[PDB]
Subunit: 114 residues, 3 copies
């Protein structure tokens, strides 16, 4: 699985250990092994949400399966929760796009997972 | 809806009001209210288009519906137009990918649609 | 075609001809002309792969056709190869997501390819 966060929040407000925490939580939440979890955080971004430049995030989670109605609802609670608690971002200023990737459309290590 | 622009154009060439303009115009164009429009502009990027490093942009627009043949044609005119007029980027150096998101695959506010 | 690389490798370690190289190689590999190829490299990123912050990359290749099982398998070899040699990134720390774009969903030059 792959999680990317884009946010106008400053670099200095991203706590040390945020990436490891995202890794550990996403592992538990998706049921996938941490070695396969990647996380990416892009602060200091020039963005707006609903015309306002108060703290916000635009994120995405890609996975081969482990993506669906119930699962996505659950991930939103978890991840908005973490963006709220660690980055002080209100959950009504967060979008997260989910992508159920086909195994043939994910490369890793000189091949694909198909 | 969500619009992201990535460009090699410098931050200082992005005019004051560009994000608000994109917000207003996307609202009108998609028919969705401005509060639900997000915009993201990433300047100073290391990128090339056709091997040339003259000004260019790689962009994406994500929306739950309001995405299709004619609508996408219309958005290209609008958005290439704005990148041309405000960022001085030639429209033959712009790509925009459109994504019709399923409501279940977009989180907002502790849940999904 | 479009190729984006996101990496924790510093900007100074990205060689100056990397974008042209990616362009030329993707042209040969996809069978499209170099003028249709765009490439984007985002260094200095705050990321982790499998809990570790050693060099890694999250990438994506978008194209209208020229995307599929065998082709993707081949592109992974090529691109991991380039990331290994030029950016000194181990291939087991690379993901590439492939996207077979419908022509109606790609804009260029005031219109779409539909």
């Amino acid at each position: 699985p792959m999680f990317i966060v884009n946010t106008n929040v400053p670099r200095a407000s991203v706590p040390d250990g945020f990436l490891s925490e995202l890794t550990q939580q996403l592992a538990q939440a998706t049921g996938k092994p941490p070695q396969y979890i990647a996380v990416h955080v892009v602060p200091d971004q020039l963005m707006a949400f609903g015309g306002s430049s108060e703290p916000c995030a635009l994120c995405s989670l890609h996975s081969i399966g482990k993506i669906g109605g119930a699962q996505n609802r659950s991930y939103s609670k978890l991840l908005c929760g973490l963006l709220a608690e660690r980055l002080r971002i209100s959950p009504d200023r967060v979008y997260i796009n989910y992508y159920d990737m086909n195994a043939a459309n994910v490369a890793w290590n000189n091949s694909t997972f198909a």
